[PDB]
Design a protein around this ligand. Structure first.
Ligand SMILES: [Zn+2]
Lengths: 217, 25, 129, 56, 71, 83, 132, 101, 221
RNA sequence: UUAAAGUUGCUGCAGUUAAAAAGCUCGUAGUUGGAUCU
RNA sequence: CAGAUACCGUCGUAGUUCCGACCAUAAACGAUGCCGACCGGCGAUGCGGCGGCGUUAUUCCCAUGACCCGCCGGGCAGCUUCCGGGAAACCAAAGUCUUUGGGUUCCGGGGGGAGUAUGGUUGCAAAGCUGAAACUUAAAGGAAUUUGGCGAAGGGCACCACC
RNA sequence: AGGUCUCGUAGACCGUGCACCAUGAGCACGAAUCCU
């Protein structure tokens, strides 16, 4: 983030992190995540250090904004936890979304209809999206994966340690990554609260959709 | 023909010819 | 048990160079070993290196770079002459434009070109290219 | 759009083998077989025997 | 080799002699029985006298009467 | 590669990896052309210049590209010093 | 049974991909629509196409689809993606804060804020549910 | 070739185990190699338990079970369909099949 | 008749923007058309077939024979390639073999021996390749020696522009496909061996993706 | 008879399944033996 | 059973059991010598040591045993892979090998003849150790994919199969 | 004071067996040289 004091925790981002739950992870250790972590406690939940997560979120934002054209940034998700978040992320930034059932050979087979030659890949989860990571080897695609404590670190380039199992955590982090890249692009200022809604990027089940829309107007 | 009974037949032939040589003198 | 200490040290640093590790631990130490990496570091193949000086045989930690291909030994230490040096470097080196042979010499442990230009030779130690 | 050429009869030997040479798209059943493909069966006279032709 | 001492020459030489004795083409040329059993006795050509003309058959599928001479 | 004449003779020079300091071959398709955007020191917006790096495919396949990029950011000072 | 082949399914999927605004749940309207925008040389194939288009529009009106792509982005899910509660669902009056995370706040940048309360120790037991 | 990583047994650092005898056959199969069966069943099976219940001097008497351990040779274990053959990739499953019934 | 591309590299080489394919070899971009090679290399790219063999899978209707065709490709100023295509008809197998050899051409560098005078003639180091159970060595040679090897790597090293070398082969070299691929991945390794004159720190110029991206995204959709 | 034979391998062969590690241990020659002295 | 001095069943000698005197051969097999250095992750189990909330040998305090959370060292083992290797099955060793060299014992040069003959040696006997040649042949063998064929297993269909 | 507690489905093991191989002449069968 640099030594300049404009890109740190103001007062409330850490409060949103502790409310959503981006600080506690799984229950097994990983040898590539031995530094993005502090200590295992009782009940066996490892705690992720938060400043390192913030620094790699700045690093991923810098890597996204570094390329001039935003139309060739492929954002990828297949799990139902982050279908809406990547779609509205691509709507906010101008990225190209793939949401649910990523086709094999999208970057390799060139005569098929679903063909794309992008420049940057942004991946929700490395274990679930192991097929884009394999297809990112044959063509020169750098990638950013929101990793967990129980995610293998294979063919990855920027790892952001977080709990990618709760919908609030992934929705908030996709939203604030969009916030950071639109701040770095030169459209959003840091001085005022611009924010639309943190819940606007959240996936929610049809049962709770039905009961809350019946309870509310 | 496996090796066990081939070895047994060679052993029996060797025993017979050795007995014939030792009783021939 | 351990007999050729230089062979173990060069096998360890070759494995560390192959797997891309920046630093490696060498468990024993000797004057011949530290003179060998002095020759290597003067030639520019490696970088800085420390000596863990204690009351036993010391330990060496090195700062490797990517300019190293392979480290090897010649066991046992055969003796060579000035006539037979070209026979060794014709079949022990990948090219005649780089790569060096380190051999023990009464004028000091040194590379093959210095031994050629001061006209002396001795028992062989190993190679690096 | 497609073609099928087959030659049957005595071809280099006494056992009568048939050789088939196909390419392209070709249907085999339906009402449009009446008005998309054409049939022709001819008999060829040789010194050693007769050969059949079923071109389509 | 795998016995690689600086003062290992007689062991390597004896092992090489024994493993070279364990051969066929060298054992044919360096033994007296393999040349004693040769009909020519180590000669290129030889002369002989014909006593009977014998006709022999052939091997598997290729079958023809090949004609030889007993000398 | 030079010669005894004094002019360049090779057709092109290959790139160097920034972690293990090896080259990237012409048929190695797992190389990276990562660029990290450095920003203005009083506003924080993108200035225009980039900061490029390169990591070979074997380091990706072992899985240590992320800590490599972190060390290059530590050396370039883009990431914070204490971390 | 009435199990239809890939021709009618692919034709209905591509005609609902190209045309989503000018169709509907009425069979006798979109049947003549798929007559006037698509050249089908048969009639039973047209009937199966219109029935399958009606079935998939009922399916996409009820819930999400997993066979086609959307450009009008599904108004019935757009309203659920654009409705907002009054509360921001994260600014709680009190947070259940681990003392380990209290030390995480204590050592990083901050001290003790009023929004974070130290949890009483209810962690006297352990984990790793028995597997043998 | 070598079909399995082990040799159809559970011997790694022993070299000798005590032999046992089969139930159907009389083969001297080693103990760690044989298929061992432990089944539990009632003394009389469920075709007569109601008639046994309405023939007792007790009230709500519980029928006892029967315990026996069976040692099977592998030829007898396949001929009696206790264990079947598998594919190459399906052979790497040390877990038992699920017992829904 | 006129070519229309699929990928972005077709636009990049047809809009008079990629001056040479050395940039593509520098950035290691994959190639997926047998026509950028037609654009950059003219009539210097010869084609000679190595071997035709039959391969047979055999069913209840007897054996059906598809034909495997090895071919080696390369201009005589550097780049050399190889490609194996197997199909039923001979002519389309030969044409597909030409196409697949035309995609995968690798650039090579040549060194000296003893003194660095004149144009280079031999390989700069000792490089080998590994596939199957065959070994192909490439040992540098003094001038005027010529290529001493089997006829298939004689063809490969004469076509690649290597004037002279020394080779040595070990293993079952009767299988010509495995031996030819060993020679191909041995000669492709003449870059991947770091030499002391390549020790200085490289500089990364602008990638051709970043060079004309605004023109690229408006000249194709 | 030599090279091709890296099918006698000192440079420079192999020993799970193709030719092949003694059933295992102890044991005198022979071989090889840790660091350090301007 | 066409044919059983074979499979199957009823008896049954020598042996199977002990003490002493012998032989030294097994698919004695991890079909992989011994020592030493280096080279990924994870979860378990056996031993010894060490640290720490909590429960129990009933309620308070210490040490002991038990359970739980880790760490260290040796050992029998397990799961995954573009570290790497191999002809492939496969291997954390069968890796660190043309970019060959840590040290040291035994052992193999196509397949038969043949572990046979002779000579020696050991043994009460049976038999172990060393061990050829003449002659003959262009094959003998290792890994693995497709139809084939089962007196192997698992499914599906049929009023020219059944209920 | 009520008197048939509510909700959902595998809960299938429970009697099944075999004397055997001796049957035997056959197998191959294209590339032109292709621009295309
Ligand atoms: Zn049995």
């Amino acid at each position: 983030s640099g030594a300049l004091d404009v890109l740190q925790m103001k007062e409330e981002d850490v409060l949103k992190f502790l409310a959503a739950g981006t600080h506690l992870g799984g229950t097994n250790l990983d040898f590539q995540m031995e530094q993005y972590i502090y200590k295992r406690k009782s009940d066996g939940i490892y705690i992720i250090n938060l400043k390192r997560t913030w620094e790699k979120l700045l690093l991923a934002a810098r890597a996204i904004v570094a390329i001039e054209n935003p139309a060739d940034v492929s954002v990828i998700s297949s799990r139902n936890t982050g279908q809406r978040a990547v779609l509205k992320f691509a709507a906010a930034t101008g990225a190209t979304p793939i949401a649910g059932r990523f086709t094999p050979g999208t970057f390799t087979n060139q005569i098929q209809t679903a063909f794309r030659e992008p420049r940057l890949l942004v991946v929700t989860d490395p274990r679930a999206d192991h097929q884009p990571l394999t297809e990112a080897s044959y063509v020169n695609l750098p990638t950013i994966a929101l990793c967990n404590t129980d995610s293998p670190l294979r063919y990855v380039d920027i790892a952001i340690p977080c709990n990618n199992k709760g919908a609030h955590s992934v929705g908030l982090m996709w939203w604030m990554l969009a916030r950071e890249v639109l701040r770095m692009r030169g459209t959003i200022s840091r001085e005022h609260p611009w924010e639309v809604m943190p819940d606007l990027y959240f996936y929610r089940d049809p049962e709770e959709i039905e009961k809350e829309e019946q309870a509310a107007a | 023909m496996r090796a066990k009974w081939r070895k047994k037949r060679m052993r029996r032939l060797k025993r017979k010819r050795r007995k014939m040589r030792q009783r021939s003198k | 048990v351990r007999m050729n200490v230089l062979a173990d040290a060069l096998k360890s640093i070759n494995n560390a160079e192959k797997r891309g590790k920046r630093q490696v631990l060498i468990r024993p130490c000797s004057k011949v070993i530290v003179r060998f990496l002095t020759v290597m570091m003067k030639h520019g193949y490696i970088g800085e290196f420390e000596i863990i000086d204690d009351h036993r045989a010391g330990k060496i930690v090195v700062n490797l770079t990517g300019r190293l291909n392979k480290c090897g030994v010649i066991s046992p230490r055969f003796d060579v002459q000035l006539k037979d040096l070209e026979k060794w470097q014709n079949n022990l080196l990948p090219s005649r434009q780089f790569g060096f042979i380190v051999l023990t010499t009464s004028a000091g442990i040194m590379d093959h070109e210095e031994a050629r230009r001061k006209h002396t030779g001795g028992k062989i130690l190993g190679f690096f290219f | 759009k497609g073609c099928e050429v087959v030659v049957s009869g005595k071809l280099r030997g006494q056992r009568a083998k048939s050789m088939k040479f196909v390419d392209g798209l070709m249907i085999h059943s339906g009402d449009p077989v009446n008005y998309y493909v054409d049939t022709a069966v001819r008999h060829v006279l040789l010194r050693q025997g007769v050969l059949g032709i079923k071109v389509k | 080799g795998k016995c690689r001492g600086l003062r290992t020459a007689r062991k390597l030489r004896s092992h090489r002699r024994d493993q070279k004795w364990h051969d066929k083409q060298y054992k044919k040329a360096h033994l007296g029985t393999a040349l004693k059993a040769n009909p020519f006795g180590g000669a290129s050509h030889a002369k002989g006298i014909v006593l009977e003309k014998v006709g022999v058959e052939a091997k598997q599928p290729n079958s023809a009467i090949r004609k030889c001479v007993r000398v | 590669m030079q010669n005894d004449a004094g002019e360049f003779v090779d057709l092109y020079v290959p790139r160097k990896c920034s972690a293990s300091n090896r080259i990237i071959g012409a048929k190695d398709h797992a190389s990276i052309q990562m660029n990290v955007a450095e920003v203005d020191k009083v506003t924080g917006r993108f200035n225009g210049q980039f900061k490029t790096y390169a990591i070979c495919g074997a380091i990706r396949r072992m899985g240590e590209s992320d800590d490599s990029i972190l060390r290059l950011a530590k050396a370039d000072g883009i990431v914070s010093k204490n971390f | 049974g009435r199990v239809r082949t890939k021709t009618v399914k692919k034709a209905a999927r591509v005609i609902i991909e190209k045309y989503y605004t000018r169709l509907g749940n009425d069979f006798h309207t979109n049947k003549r629509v798929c007559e006037e925008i698509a050249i089908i040389p048969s009639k039973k194939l047209r009937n199966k196409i219109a029935g399958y288009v009606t079935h998939l529009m009922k399916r996409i009106q009820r819930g999400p689809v997993r066979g086609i792509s959307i450009k009008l982005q599904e108004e019935e899910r757009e309203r659920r993606d654009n409705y907002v509660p009054e509360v921001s669902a994260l600014d709680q009056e009190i947070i259940e804060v681990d003392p380990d995370t209290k030390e995480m706040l204590k050592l990083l940048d901050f001290g003790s804020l009023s929004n974070l309360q130290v949890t009483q120790p209810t962690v006297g037991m352990n984990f790793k549910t028995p597997r043998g | 070739t070598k079909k399995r990583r082990n040799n159809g047994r559970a011997k790694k650092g022993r070299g000798h185990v005590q032999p046992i005898r089969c139930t159907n056959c009389a083969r001297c199969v080693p103990k760690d190699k044989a298929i061992k069966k432990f089944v539990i069943r009632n003394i009389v099976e469920a075709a007569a338990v109601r008639d046994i219940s309405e023939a007792s001097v007790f009230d709500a008497y519980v029928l006892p079970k029967l315990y026996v351990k069976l040692h099977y040779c592998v030829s007898c274990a396949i001929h009696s369909k206790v264990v079947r053959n598998r594919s190459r990739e399906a052979r790497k499953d040390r877990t038992p099949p699920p017992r829904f019934r | 008749k006129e070519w229309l591309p699929v990928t972005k590299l077709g636009r990049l080489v047809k809009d008079m923007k990629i001056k040479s394919l050395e940039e593509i070899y520098l950035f290691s971009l994959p190639i997926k058309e047998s026509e950028i090679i037609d654009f950059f290399l003219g009539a210097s790219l010869k084609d000679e077939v190595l071997k035709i063999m039959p391969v047979q899978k055999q069913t209840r209707a007897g054996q059906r024979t598809r034909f495997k065709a090895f071919v080696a490709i390369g201009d005589y100023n550097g780049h050399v390639g190889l490609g194996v295509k197997c199909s039923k008809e001979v002519a389309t197998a030969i044409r597909g073999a030409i196409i697949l050899a035309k995609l995968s051409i690798v650039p090579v560098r040549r060194g000296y021996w003893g003194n660095k005078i004149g144009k280079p003639h031999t390989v700069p180091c000792k490089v080998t390749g590994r596939c199957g159970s065959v070994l192909v060595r490439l040992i540098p040679a003094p001038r005027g020696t010529g290529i001493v090897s089997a006829p298939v790597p004689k063809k490969l090293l004469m076509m690649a522009g290597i004037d002279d070398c020394y080779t040595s082969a070990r293993g079952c070299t009767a299988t010509l496909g495995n031996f030819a691929k060993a020679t191909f991945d041995a000669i492709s390794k003449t870059y991947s061996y770091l030499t002391p004159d390549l020790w200085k720190e490289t500089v990364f110029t602008k990638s051709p993706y970043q060079e004309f991206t605004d023109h690229l995204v408006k000249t194709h959709t």
